[PDB]
Structures are given as C-alpha cells and as structure tokens.
Design a binder for this molecule. Structure first.
Ligand SMILES: CC(C)CN(C[C@@H](O)[C@@H](Cc1ccccc1)NC(=O)O[C@H]1CO[C@H]2OCC[C@H]21)S(=O)(=O)c1ccc(N)cc1
Ligand SMILES: CC(C)CN(C[C@@H](O)[C@H](Cc1ccccc1)NC(=O)O[C@H]1CO[C@H]2OCC[C@H]21)S(=O)(=O)c1ccc(N)cc1
Lengths: 99, 99
C-alpha cells in the first residue's frame, strides 16, 4: 500500500496465534510490543526513548506477519505505550518513506 | 525521494533561518525540536514516549523547510535527544509509507 499520515499508521500484526496491531514507526530502531503470549526465555536489554531508558525482554528469531508480509527478527517486550514496528522489521517488508 | 530504512531517516531542515537535521518519524504525532528561539507566544504542554514524559513549549504556525519542502504547523520545543518531524508536518509535504 501507499499510506498517508493523517492518522497513526497502524497495521495488523500476527505472532503465533495472536492477532494484534502496531504502529509503523520510522523513528524506532527497534520493534517493541507490550505482551507476547508464551514467548519462552528472553535476554534483558535497555532501550532509550524521549523520557529516559527502560528495561525490555529481548526475543530473537520471532516470526511475525506485518500487514500480510512475513518478517523474522528480534521483538522486544517492554513498557511501550503503544506496540511499535521499528526499522529492524520495516526493512524486511520493504517499507520506504516517500515524498 | 524514496528513503529506505537501513539507517535512521534523517533529513536537512530549516527553521528560524537555521539549517538543522531531523528524524522523519511516522511514530510521532507531533514535531519536537531541541531548545531554540522561535517567534510568537508559546503554551506549556507535556509529551509522552518511551521512558516517560517531558515538558515542552508549543509554538503554533511555525514555518519549517523539510528537505526542501515548506511546511507550516505546530512545533514543540523541549529536551528531546533528537529533532523529530512528526505526522503533523509530514502530512503537509505529502510523505507516505510504501510497501
Ligand atoms: C522548552 C523548555 C524551555 C521548557 N521550560 C522548562 C524548564 O523546566 C527548563 C527548560 C530548560 C532549561 C535549560 C536549558 C534549556 C531548557 N528550565 C528553564 O527554562 O530555565 C530555568 C530553570 O532553572 C534555571 O535555568 C535557567 C533559568 C531557570 S518552561 O517554558 O518553563 C515549561 C514548563 C512546564 C511545561 N509543561 C512546559 C514548559
Ligand atoms: C514511542 C512512539 C509511540 C512515540 N515516539 C516517537 C518514536 O519514533 C521515537 C523517536 C525517538 C528516537 C530517538 C530517541 C528518542 C525518541 N523512537 C523511540 O522511542 O524508539 C525507541 C525504540 O527503538 C529505539 O530506537 C530509538 C530509541 C528507541 S516519541 O519520541 O516518545 C514522541 C511522542 C510524541 C510526539 N509528539 C513526538 C515524539
């Protein structure tokens, strides 16, 4: 698709059997969601934002569908105020910013 | 242009007559710039992101050139670690996400 930005660019995502949605965020290096069901063991990691730094749970090799495109990569679980798809996965679905 | 997302999508901006650079951020509702002087009366606001809230000054109807394209709109000024162009100005230059 070609998505305009008059509202937040939210898309469906699917991980395992869970359908969620998330914000396509070109300002995010990393993908972060609030919860992922039965994800297994994780590794601690720190991530920084506008307000300071947060501890997250890092899961690698996650298979995720984004807007009907398959991606595989690192998904962080942490106290983000909204699920975000960051550039580590946006590149895999071939998203670009255009103007 | 078409911007791929293998690195942060930073572009040149011009604001207050000064050349700066800023992140094109589809995940940001509003534009936030580091400390600088702007014209007009401002209003106090708070903005929330990862890791918490920050206090900003809101200035309205500010001209900003974004990679050669003129935009006019709301600009928040405050202790962000990076200049961010949010959707409020991305929409004025017709920026879209494509995949
Ligand atoms: C964009 C910033 C300037 C915002 N200011 C916030 C303020 O806490 C900081 C913002 C600040 C601080 C330093 C450098 C840049 C910005 N301090 C400041 O302006 O200086 C005063 C604080 O102690 C002293 O330092 C010099 C005189 C005093 S503010 O206009 O007073 C304001 C306060 C509350 C909200 N919600 C929104 C804005
Ligand atoms: C978290 C999003 C819902 C909102 N944020 C925009 C987002 O693009 C920020 C924009 C950003 C970018 C750099 C530093 C601070 C904020 N990126 C971010 O927090 O990414 C974090 C996860 O990946 C990491 O890569 C960047 C830091 C990590 S935000 O900066 O807090 C913000 C919130 C409201 C407005 N008006 C403007 C910006």
């Amino acid at each position: 698709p070609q998505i305009t930005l008059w509202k937040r660019p939210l898309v469906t995502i699917k991980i395992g059997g869970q359908l969620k949605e998330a914000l396509l965020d070109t300002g995010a290096d990393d993908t972060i969601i609030e919860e992922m069901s039965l994800p297994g063991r994780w590794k601690p990691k720190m991530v920084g934002g506008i307000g300071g730094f947060i501890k997250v749970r890092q899961y690698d090799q996650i298979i995720i569908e984004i807007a009907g495109h398959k991606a595989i990569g690192t998904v962080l679980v942490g106290p983000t105020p909204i699920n975000i798809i960051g550039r580590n996965l946006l590149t895999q679905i071939g998203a670009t910013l255009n103007f």
